Amino acid sequence: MPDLNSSTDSAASASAASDVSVESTAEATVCTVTLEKMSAGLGFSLEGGKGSLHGDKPLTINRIFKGAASEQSETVQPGDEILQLGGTAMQGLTRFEAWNIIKALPDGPVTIVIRRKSLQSKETTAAGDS
């Protein structure tokens, strides 16, 4: 298998990347950051509500603790819809099961990915606007 599949029914995933168009909606922004797994839960806990493949359980940070996120500004956010942690993806995980894979992660840089959409957002790069 050198390149994608070919010489057959034209059916090869293409999609694009790098460049993005179509501005977001309702003001949506993502904040990929790394936490430190050492306080037994990155000092943060996720709350939300699993569903049944028919609704949507956007786990979110509810109880953040003080004792981390000090190596690069605040790497945490309250009520943020974090989709995946340094090792757990909420979208394919229940609330408890989700916060469980993290706790079971190793002791290092836990990568968080949060997309805050809708009002309640103040970080549109205001440190130097033309």
How far apart, in whole angstroms, are the C-alpha atoms of residue 14 and residue 127?
A: 37
**All residues at 6 or more sequence positions from 44 whose CB lies less than 8 Å from its CB, including other chains:** 35, 61, 63, 64, 65, 76
DSSP state of 89: B
The topology under which CATH files domain 1-130 is: Pdz3 Domain (2.30.42)
Dihedral sign computed on CA atoms, order 115, 118, 122, 123: positive
3-state secondary structure of 98: helix
Closest by Cα among 90, 111, 15 to 48:
90
Cβ-based burial of 117 (10 A; exposed 0-12, middle 13-18, buried ≥19): middle
